[PDB]
């Protein structure tokens, strides 16, 4: 689980969202992964813009930030799961690392800011749903 808390923004996991996400909904992207409602509080995350392709993510089942390098976001085959088909899912980087099912919301940061969330996982891989070309999440 995780979220990023940017502005008056909740950044999700569109498969992990929740009743009160879909009721203040923002923007959602099945293709993505991606879901953001609206929040009553102010967030304290900033989002990063630029084109890194180092940084550190948080992965819940080490309780631990590793440091990763990763690629470009691109379109990806993923497997099939309890929450998608296998399908082609866009604006995701690969990195080499540890990730369990429940490690999607750990945010990925570089020194910029928020990169992305966690989305997939399996075989010492970790995926990331890149947020940096969401520019509207830095106003209104
Ligand atoms: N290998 C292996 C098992 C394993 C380990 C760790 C994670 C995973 N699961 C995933 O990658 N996702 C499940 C939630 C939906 C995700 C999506 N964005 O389509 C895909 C699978
Ligand atoms: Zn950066």
């Given amino acids: 689980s995780g979220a990023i808390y940017v502005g008056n923004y909740r950044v999700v996991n569109r498969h992990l969202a929740t009743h009160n996400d879909w009721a203040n909904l923002v923007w959602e992207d099945s293709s993505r992964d991606l879901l953001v409602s609206s929040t009553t509080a102010q967030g304290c995350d ?3 813009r630029c084109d890194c392709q180092t940084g550190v993510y948080y992965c819940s089942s080490r309780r631990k930030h ?4 990763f690629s470009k976001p691109s379109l990806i085959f993923v497997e099939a799961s309890e929450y998608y088909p296998a399908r082609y899912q866009s604006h995701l980087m690969l990195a080499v690392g ?3 099912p429940g490690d999607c919301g750990g945010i990925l940061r570089c ?3 928020v990169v992305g969330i966690v989305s997939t996982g399996g075989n010492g891989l970790v995926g ?3 947020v940096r070309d ?3 999440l830095d106003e209104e």
């Fill in 111 to 113: 020194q910029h800011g």
């Fill in 66 to 69: 590793y440091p990763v390098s």
């Fill in 134 to 136: 969401l520019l509207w």
């Fill in 128 to 130: 990331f749903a890149d």
């Fill in 98 to 100: 540890h990730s369990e």
């Fill in 46 to 48: 900033t989002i990063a």
